[PDB]
Ligand binder design. Structure first.
Ligand SMILES: Nc1ncnc2c1ncn2[C@@H]1O[C@H](COS(=O)(=O)NC(=O)c2csc(-c3nc4ccc(O)cc4s3)n2)[C@@H](O)[C@H]1O
Length: 533
């Protein structure tokens, strides 16, 4: 058992009851403390108090409960990051209705298939996303109601969140006497997240564990709710969803930035007195280089975190020195593990490490071809188990069991080693998966589009390392015998077929063979790609 790394016992205890109960219990409290702000849009200088947030989420839960929704139902929240985003999430959580967040970047096909899985009864959506929701509802009969999020009044004949609640609540309804539902938090699903595409069922139990990590003085943030954090992370993904839920149960003021502005990301830090910034590894070179950074009162900024993708050790400690931080704080996780399950422990900074095993979890490194558990400083595939690991892929047990073994070990597709202090380091990726500016890009979609081309015999798609995007989608192309085609042509061809995140920005390299085994070798493909550039 010396080769199994285990989290310590939690520094903030696990709390009783559903995640809805825990959220409600905590926000009801913040809601009684005058002037406590829950969310701030940094762009337009608009705040929503905890009081207001709590009241609207409660109005929403009762309305939904009266509309007929129970633990047998799901909803979708399809919306770009906004002040209103969490209202239906919290609302549904209070009553045990599963929330299925949809990526606001999704096209109609991806969206249709996401919701084909989640089977939601009601859909919450912004103005931007309504027309897509409509085109889907036609093909998806189970959707019976579409409610607009970023409108106060009704819109194109559809109820807003506000008119929807006034119409389903009994008059003289009191929010502060609402009691959230109790249910078996192990079997009641809190969220169904997309995993590129499948539905990741996350029970309430997993959220309860996250709420422990979140308020943990070592593995999250110490609970002084007089705290302001700035977050630039998409709400619809696990990184943004479970950090933010943890910030709310902590009573933090969550300051939001949707677009990174060099002039703003520093101004917002100074004016709002940001104590902690939750960032993605792409903004780090910016924050390492910019000279404007020098003149603001940031004495209140004691922490900067990153996650979701690799952070350069060197860049990380540069940004850490400039801000007089002990180091960049980090978290590593997958959608299937709910949230981060490796996290840099406060006071235990070690540059380049993504952190240590969180409480309740275990981690191990298994050899790439024998599957044997390995020891200290040995590169292998990282496997994890613990109570935030998803219940399983919604209506896909075969993909569930290939990912999660008989003993609960989830093999992550990442390559890692742990050192003597039990610090973990992520040094490579086994699986085929690209992250372009945080956005997931499945190589298989790109490959099938490439093969479609008459001049293309075979192709392999992987990530090309980019300093400001992390990875650029790029391809090894094997031309059909005696057929010709340039890189520019292959690129515009693919562009015509794909949404903006999947554009083959990394270019193309021509080869005689796409590296395979007995399945595509992502590492060998990334190798050939860089060998060029
Ligand atoms: N820190 C990291 N370093 C290097 N690689 C990282 C990484 N995090 C995710 N990855 C990669 O993303 C993959 C998973 O992709 S994924 O499905 O989209 N899911 C995620 O990326 C994911 C799900 S939850 C989560 C995080 N939560 C946090 C909470 C606090 C904090 O300080 C930092 C973090 S990161 N990230 C991993 O397998 C790995 O390849």
């Amino acid at each position: 058992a010396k080769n199994i790394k285990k989290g310590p016992a939690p520094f903030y205890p696990l709390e009783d009851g559903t995640a809805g109960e825990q959220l409600h219990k905590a926000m009801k409290r913040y809601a009684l403390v005058p002037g406590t702000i829950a969310f701030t849009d940094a762009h337009i200088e608009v705040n929503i108090t905890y009081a207001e947030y709590f009241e609207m989420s409660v109005r929403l839960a009762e309305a939904m409960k009266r509309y007929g929704l129970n633990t047998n139902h799901r909803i979708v929240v399809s919306s770009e990051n906004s002040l209103q985003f969490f209202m239906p999430v919290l609302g549904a959580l209070f009553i045990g209705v599963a929330v299925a967040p949809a990526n606001d970047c999704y096209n109609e096909r991806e969206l249709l298939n996401s919701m084909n899985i989640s089977q939601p009864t009601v859909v919450f959506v912004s103005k931007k996303g309504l027309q897509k929701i409509l085109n889907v509802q036609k093909k998806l009969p189970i959707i019976q109601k579409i409610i607009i999020m970023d409108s106060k009044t009704d819109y194109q004949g559809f109820q807003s969140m506000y008119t929807f609640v006034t119409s389903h609540l009994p008059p003289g309804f009191n929010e502060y006497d609402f009691v959230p539902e109790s249910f078996d938090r192990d079997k009641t699903i809190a969220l169904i997240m997309n995993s590129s595409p499948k539905g990741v069922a996350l029970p309430h139990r997993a959220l309860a564990v996250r709420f422990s990590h979140a308020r943990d003085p070592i593995f999250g943030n110490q609970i002084a709710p007089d705290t302001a954090i700035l977050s630039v992370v998409p709400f619809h993904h696990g990184f943004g969803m479970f950090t933010t839920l943890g910030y709310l149960i902590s009573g933090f003021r969550v300051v939001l930035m949707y677009r990174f502005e060099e002039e703003l990301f520093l101004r917002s830090l100074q004016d709002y007195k940001i104590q902690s910034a939750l960032l993605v590894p792409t903004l780090f070179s910016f924050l390492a280089k910019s000279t404007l950074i020098d003149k603001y009162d940031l004495s209140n900024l004691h922490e900067i975190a990153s996650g979701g993708a690799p952070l350069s050790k060197e860049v990380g400690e540069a940004v850490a020195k400039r801000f007089h931080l002990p180091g960049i704080r980090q978290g590593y996780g997958l959608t299937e593990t709910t949230s981060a399950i490796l996290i840099t422990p406060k006071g235990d900074d070690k540059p380049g490490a993504v952190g240590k095993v969180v409480p309740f979890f275990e981690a191990k490194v298994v050899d790439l071809d024998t599957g044997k558990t390995l020891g200290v400083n040995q590169r292998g595939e990282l496997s994890v188990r613990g109570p935030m690991i998803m219940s399983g892929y919604v209506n896909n047990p075969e993909a569930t069991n290939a990912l999660i073994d008989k003993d609960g070990w989830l093999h992550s597709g990442d390559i890692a080693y742990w050192d003597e202090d039990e610090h973990f380091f992520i040094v490579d990726r086994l699986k085929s998966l690209i992250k372009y500016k945080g956005c997931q890009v499945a190589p298989a979609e790109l490959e099938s589009i490439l093969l479609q081309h008459p001049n293309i015999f075979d192709a392999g798609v992987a990530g090309l390392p980019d300093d400001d995007a992390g990875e650029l989608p790029a391809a090894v192309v094997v031309l059909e015998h005696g057929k010709t085609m340039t890189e520019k042509e292959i690129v515009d061809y693919v562009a015509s077929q794909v949404t903006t995140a999947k554009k083959l920005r990394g270019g193309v390299v021509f080869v005689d063979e796409v590296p395979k085994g007995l399945k595509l070798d992502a590492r060998k493909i990334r190798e050939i790609l860089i060998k060029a550039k």
